[PDB]
Every structure is written in C-alpha cells, then in structure tokens.
C-alpha cells in the first residue's frame, strides 16, 4: 500500500528522479530513478505516484506546485508514495486517496 | 523537459513576448521576451516552442490561429512550452510532440 519514503541528500545534489505529468494519466509520477541516488536509497520506484509531501496531500495540486514543494523542502523531504498499479486500482475503485495511510505487505 | 507557463496580465497590458515564423525553422517560436514582463515572470525563455495553448496542441497550427488562441484567452493563458534545445533534439529523434507533458528533474 502507501509507503512513507524519507529522502535526504547533499547540498547541490539531486534526489535523482523525474516528476512528470503524463498525457491522459492521473497523478504525479515518479520516473527515471537514477541508480545509487537518494531516491533509490529511500525506496522510490518507477511509476510511483506522490500522494503527500511532508504530510500535505498533493495529488490534486498542479505539477509546478508539487515540484516547488519538493524544492523548498531543502535537503530532506518525506514523500507518501503509492505504486502505479495500486494507485490505478485505487482510482478505478474510486478510493479516497486522502484516507490512505502506510500499509506494507510481508 | 516541457513546462507549463501560466501567464497573467492586467487588462490592456501585453504579455511581453513575440511569436514568429522563421525560415527553415520548425514550430511556434517565442522571441523577444521583455525584461520584467508577464512572459518573463511565467518562465518563458527565448527559443521556446509553443506545444499547447490551454491544453490544445498547436505545433502544426497556422501562426495566425496560434496568435488568435493566445489573444482569445483574455488576460491569462497557459502555455506548454519546450525549450529550444529539447525541441530541436525531439524533432531529430522523431519524438511525437503530442505525447510530451510537464516534467521536472529533482
């Protein structure tokens, strides 16, 4: 289910991913995670959607805002992410994404 | 990658950019971005290409209809632009410009 990913990096360093809007696709997508990066080390996966940034729900914010939020968070940031399939399955079944909290399968 | 620039102006004010048709040049070119202008504030960069206006794909529209789409948007307009370097690289690599949307590197 959702995961809380605690990213941390050095000054001048990128976290090492793209945030994207994709044509006819819901959500703020994480793509092209660089090998060995802060993003990788924190558990980010290709196709994850960003639900929250430092606990603030952003699924309905504009891309520019979501980017700004990451950027203004400085050299650490907490992302609540959901994998692409769980995210599409949640939106399919009209689940309230706001009410989703961390869940792990073991 | 592409950016959405959200330009806003006062009534009777100009945005502060030109659109041109240039010989042996692909696409709807943003030129002459006035310093201090709405265009500059929104993040337009010289050599930017206009891909979409209020979401509508225009790279293959006539210059006259693109200008008119901007004017008809009144005192704000949303432009999906792709910087001149990324755009020239995309046309070479035969990328479908219709499929490009906002992207940021973090």
Curated annotation (Swiss-Prot), chains A, B:
Q: Where is the signal peptide?
A: none
Domain PDZ residues, every copy:
4-85
Q: Cellular location of this protein?
A: Membrane; Cell membrane
Expression by tissue? Expressed in kidney, liver, small intestine. brain, lung, and testis (at protein level).
**Domain of life according to the entry:** Eukaryota
User: What the protein does?
Assistant: A scaffold protein that connects plasma membrane proteins and regulatory components, regulating their surface expression in epithelial cells apical domains. May be involved in the coordination of a diverse range of regulatory processes for ion transport and second messenger cascades. In complex with NHERF1, may cluster proteins that are functionally dependent in a mutual fashion and modulate the trafficking and the activity of the associated membrane proteins. May play a role in the cellular mechanisms associated with multidrug resistance through its interaction with ABCC2 and PDZK1IP1.
The record makes one more remark, namely:
Disruption of the gene was not associated with abnormal growth and development or redistribution of interacting proteins. However, a modulation of expression of selective ion channels in the kidney, as well as increased serum cholesterol levels were observed.
How is the quaternary structure described? Interacts with PDZK1IP1 and ABCC2. Binds to the C-terminal region of SLC26A3. Interacts (via C-terminal PDZ domain) with SLC26A6 (via C-terminal domain). Interacts (via C-terminal PDZ domain) with SLC9A3 (via C-terminal domain). Component of a complex, composed of PDZK1, SYNGAP1, KLHL17 and NMDA receptors. Interacts (via PDZ1 domain) directly with KLHL17; the interaction is important for integrity of actin cytoskeleton structures in neurons. Forms a heterodimeric complex with NHERF1. Interacts with AKAP2, BCR, CFTR, SLCO1A1, SLC22A12, SLC22A4, SLC22A5, SLC26A6, NHERF2 and SLC17A1.
Q: What is known of its domains?
A: The PDZ 2 and 3 domains seem to be involved in the interaction with SLC26A3.
* Family to which the UniProt record says this protein belongs: Belongs to the NHER family.
Q: What is this protein called?
A: Na(+)/H(+) exchange regulatory cofactor NHE-RF3
**Which species does the entry assign this protein to?**
Mus musculus
